[PDB]
């Protein structure tokens, strides 16, 4: 009867994109599982994108702050790409306080050890003069998919939500000459995340989602 | 324009494609073969048509 595939290798190429292996797979099941897992991963993976941002002297996102080279809109756009991991809390409020010339990066955020910033070098903005400072509050929540700010004080700036750690998924079906048996498929899934989700955890969540959806008629 | 192109591609033949010359038991078998990837959409065959 059917051989059950299992996770045999997690080949971490870089910090962001990994390459997991599922083996063994019968004829045809390789493509079926690859496409199903690709759709599930690209569709529904929990993420921790920013939701709201509050700068002290800013009333709306179409203004400017003295000494900041970037418009508030560009700051919000940069934050929208911030990759962050939260473990214990569904919702957290990070703080960023910086003063003096230089690139205000994601590493200037308050540590808050329960929250991990995967790209400390991710530039947020630039400060041009010594007497210019940015003191701002960022609201990071768990979620799923894409939640535009339009669907969901006069100082609160909403940034569109991008709760999707995955960025690219590609599955290849190769030949697995193992178990003294020929024409057994091996599914190599190369997944490029933003660094906030474990590839093994991502595959596990995708399989769990597919099984839960499949339980409706079994 | 798109429907006619799709139908023109579907109903067409080439001298040699996958699953050519085999005899089919009906249109349902033809669709099963095409979806399964065992025969090309445009391959000369024999089909039992009612």
């Amino acid at each position: 009867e059917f051989l059950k595939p299992r996770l045999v290798d997690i080949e971490q190429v870089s910090s962001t994109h990994a390459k997991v292996t599922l083996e063994p797979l019968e004829r045809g099941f390789g493509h079926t599982l690859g496409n199903a897992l690709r759709r599930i991963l690209l569709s529904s993976m929990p993420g921790c994108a920013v939701t709201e941002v509050e700068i002290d002297g800013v009333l709306h996102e179409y203004s400017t702050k003295e000494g900041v080279q970037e418009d508030i809109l560009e700051i919000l756009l940069n934050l929208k790409g911030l990759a962050v991991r939260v473990q214990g809390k569904d919702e957290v409020i990070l703080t960023l306080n910086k003063s003096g010339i230089g690139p205000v990066t994601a590493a200037d955020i308050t540590h808050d050890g329960d929250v991990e910033i995967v790209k400390p070098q991710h530039v947020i903005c630039h400060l041009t003069d010594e007497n210019a400072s940015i003191s701002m509050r960022i609201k990071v929540q768990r979620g799923r998919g894409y939640v535009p700010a339009s669907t969901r004080p006069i100082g609160r700036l909403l940034v569109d939500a991008c709760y999707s750690p995955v960025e690219r998924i590609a599955y290849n079906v190769e030949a697995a000459r193992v178990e003294q048996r020929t024409d057994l498929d091996k599914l190599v899934i190369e997944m490029e995340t933003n660094g906030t989700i474990d590839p093994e955890e991502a595959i596990r969540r995708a399989a769990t989602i597919l099984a839960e959806q499949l339980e409706a008629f079994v | 324009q798109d429907v006619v192109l799709g139908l023109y591609y579907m109903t067409r033949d080439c001298v040699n494609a996958k699953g050519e010359g085999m005899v089919l038991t009906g249109p349902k078998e033809a669709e099963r073969l095409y979806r399964s990837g065992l025969a090309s959409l445009h391959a000369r065959v024999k089909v039992r048509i009612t």
């Binding site: 400017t64 080279q69 894409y146 | 799709g6």
Partner: protein, 249 residues
């Protein structure tokens, strides 16, 4: 930055007065979101006056077509600049090159009829990246005039509407800057003594018997057009000579 251009993008961008072309070469002494200060080189410096160029970038402002005109600096601190080089790039420009749109990955094939005649099938990634998101600035003018039956007023005491609808207004009856208004919201609520007629003794007695305190003030109350949302970015009050400008003004 069109990947496949023709070499006329830079000329078009520079010649049209949308960028901040450096009048004289020098070194960028200061640069923020709304200003550039270039310390001119000694070679190009006139005798006497000193002599550093100041470029005040035009931030978010309305165009004739209700688009957004916004100049962003394209230079950093201490970066040398030559004469004729772009310091800030206006709308539809990247590093001084005309960029009217966005270049993205396109495939030519029919797709389930969703691109049947001339339709385009766009992925959710295009809208996620907000690359074709546009800012449109819209101008709404409420004019209080001196009409018959008295003048018009910009007071916040708007009849027939609760305090919830008037929460976003200040004490002077004008919306706050930065307030997120949607269709139907009252931006500047003006109500005028130009209301309705006066009721004769029997008529007025009957009206008061019904238990209603309708006054001689009607509701004009400029409000956002239905279906239009956004954020208020500027409020300008032009007052005629000798009118006792209000607290908001």
């Amino acid at each position: 930055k069109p990947l496949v251009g023709t070499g006329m993008e830079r000329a078009v961008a520079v010649d049209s007065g949308v960028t901040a072309v450096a009048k004289r070469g020098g070194v960028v002494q200061y640069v923020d979101a709304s200003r550039i200060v270039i310390k001119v080189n000694e070679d190009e410096m006139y005798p006497g006056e000193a002599g550093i160029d100041i470029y005040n970038l035009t931030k978010y402002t309305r165009s004739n077509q209700n688009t957004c005109i916004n100049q962003m600096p394209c230079v950093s601190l201490g970066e040398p600049v030559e004469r004729g080089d772009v310091l800030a790039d206006g709308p539809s420009t990247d590093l001084g090159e005309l960029a009217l749109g966005q270049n993205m990955r396109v495939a030519f094939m029919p797709w389930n009829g969703y691109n049947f005649e001339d339709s385009i099938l766009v992925s959710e990634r295009v809208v996620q990246e907000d690359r074709f998101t546009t800012i449109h600035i819209q101008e709404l003018a409420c004019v209080s005039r001196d009409t018959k039956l008295g003048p018009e007023e910009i007071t916040a005491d708007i009849p027939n509407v609760g305090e919830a609808a008037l929460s976003k207004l200040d004490e002077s009856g004008i919306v706050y800057i930065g307030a997120e208004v949607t269709g139907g919201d009252i931006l500047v609520g003006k109500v005028t003594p130009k209301g309705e007629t006066q009721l004769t003794p029997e008529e007025k007695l009957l009206r008061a018997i019904f238990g209603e305190k309708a006054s001689d003030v009607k509701d004009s109350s400029l409000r956002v057009p239905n279906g239009v949302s956004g954020t208020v970015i500027d409020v300008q009050v032009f007052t005629r000579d000798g009118v006792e400008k209000d607290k908001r003004a």
